[PDB]
Paper text:
Human [name] ([name]) is a bifunctional DNA glycosylase of the Fpg/Nei family, which catalyzes the removal of damaged bases and subsequent incision of the newly generated abasic sites. Unlike traditional enzymes which are commonly referred to as highly specific biocatalysts, one special feature for [name] is its unique capability to recognize a wide range of substrates, including formamidopyrimidines, hydantoin lesions, oxidized, and dihydro-modified pyrimidine bases, derived from all four canonical bases. Here, by integrating structural, computational, and biochemical investigations, we show that [name] uses a triage mechanism to achieve broad specificity and reduce futile repair of normal bases. This mechanism involves two mutually competing interaction states: an activated state that commits catalysis and BER, and a quarantine state that temporarily separates and prevents the flipped base from catalysis via auto-inhibition.
For a naturally existing [name] variant ([name])14 in complex with dsDNAs containing OHU, Sp1, or Gh, the damaged bases are in close contact with the guanidine group of [name]. Such conformation of the lesion recognition loop resembles that in the [name]-Tg structure, where the positively charged side chain of residue 242 is contiguous to the solvent-exposed flipped base while the aromatic residue Y244 is laid away from the active site (thus called “242-in” conformation). Noteworthy, across all these structures, we observed an unusually short distance (~3.0 Å) between an outwards heterocyclic nitrogen atom of the nucleobases and the terminal nitrogen atom of residue 242. While repulsion is expected for the two groups if both are fully protonated (i.e., an −NH group in the nucleobase and a positively charged side chain of residue 242), we previously showed in the [name]–Tg complex that [name] utilizes a tautomerization-dependent mechanism to recognize the flipped base. In this mechanism, the base undergoes a keto-enol tautomerization event where the originally protonated heterocyclic nitrogen atom becomes a hydrogen bond acceptor and hence can be hydrogen-bonded to residue 242. The fact that different recognition states were crystallographically captured for the same edited [name]([name]) variant bound to different base lesions suggests that the flipped nucleobase per se also contributes to the stability of the interaction states. [name] repairs a diverse array of base damage, whose aromaticity and hydrophilicity differ greatly. Oxidized substrates of [name] are often bulky and contain non-planar structures; this disrupted aromaticity is expected to diminish the π–π stacking with Tyr244 and hence destabilize the quarantine state. Moreover, it is expected that the bases with less solvent interactions (e.g. DHU) would favor the formation of a stable quarantine state compared with the hydrophilic bases (Sp1, 5-OHU, Gh, and Tg).
Numbering used by the authors: 2 to 202, 222 to 290
Write the structure that this text describes.
DNA sequence: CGTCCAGTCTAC
DNA sequence: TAGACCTGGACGG
């Protein structure tokens, strides 16, 4: 997922787990190359926050829970197919690679990190990935300053469409978001990044890096809504103006990722 | 049946 | 910088 999907996933965990109590161990699928979670508690709560393309889970034992255990933080990157689902304990979806089990009483649920392609990762510790820039959703002012104070960086030599995927500067921006952002300002995707960013040192490119992904969050859904997978999927596809849309052009960037756009490809075009 | 298509991470 | 990492759906023969 991108920033909006990670943010909605964090809201799903907080909303869905608000009145739940978990017990026992954290179970990893045997095929996951991610680390075992050394955590056991008779009674713990799960909460979440998102920063860009990362999600932090906090496992917080209730007072008197046994065995003795301090809160534990886990940080997730979702890759191409990461998600969280709350399911019945004996109806685990395929590719549920990490599970947290509700304690009794009541219906036995499992909170699952589900990842079909297994591009997703998690680490022990609550640390955000070093070198990842500030969250375009939740840390806009820090994000904007971090870009404008580092335009000398060789990252800004590249086409703007490629610079927008660089997570040191645009933490949370992925492939659909770069197409939607550039389309709203009609900025050619193969314009030089430094030229577009020097020009802004009237909502501009850095502001849309915040307000555009925020619209996706405000839509809700993306697999985390009150509405079915069909209704959430229709609402998202109705919101897209550029990415995959008929009448739009598409090219491969230098890493073979497809950029969608209208009109002028821009000067650094392959 | 087959090919193509949908974000990091690492070896050159 | 190219290839690796992986599964499932759309689609073509």
């Amino acid at each position: 997922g991108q920033g909006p999907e990670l943010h909605l996933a964090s809201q799903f965990v907080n909303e869905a787990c608000r009145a739940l109590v978990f017990g026992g161990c954290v179970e990893k699928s045997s095929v996951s190359r991610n680390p075992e979670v050394p955590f056991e508690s008779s009674a713990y709560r799960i909460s979440a926050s998102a920063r860009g393309k990362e999600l932090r889970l906090i496992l917080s034992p209730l007072p008197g829970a046994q065995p003795q255990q301090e809160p534990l933080a886990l940080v997730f990157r979702f890759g191409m197919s990461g998600s969280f689902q709350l399911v019945p304990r004996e109806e685990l979806p395929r590719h549920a690679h990490l599970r947290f089990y509700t304690a009794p009483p009541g219906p036995r649920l499992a909170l699952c990190f589900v990842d079909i392609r297994r591009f997703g990762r998690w680490d022990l510790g609550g640390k955000w990935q070093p070198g990842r820039g500030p969250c375009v959703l939740q840390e806009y002012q820090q994000f904007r300053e971090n870009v404008l104070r580092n335009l000398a960086d060789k990252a800004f030599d590249r086409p703007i469409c490629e610079a927008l995927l660089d997570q040191r500067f645009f933490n949370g921006i992925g492939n659909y978001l770069r197409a939607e952002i550039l389309y709203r300002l009609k900025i050619p995707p193969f314009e030089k990044a430094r030229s577009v960013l020097e020009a802004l040192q009237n909502p501009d490119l850095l502001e849309l890096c915040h307000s555009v992904p925020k619209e996706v969050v405000q839509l809700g859904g993306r697999g985390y809504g009150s509405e079915s997978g069909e209704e959430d999927f229709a609402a998202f596809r109705a919101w897209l103006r550029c990415y995959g849309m008929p009448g739009m052009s598409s090219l491969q960037d230098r890493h073979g990722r497809t950029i969608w756009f209208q009109g002028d490809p821009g000067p650094l075009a392959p």
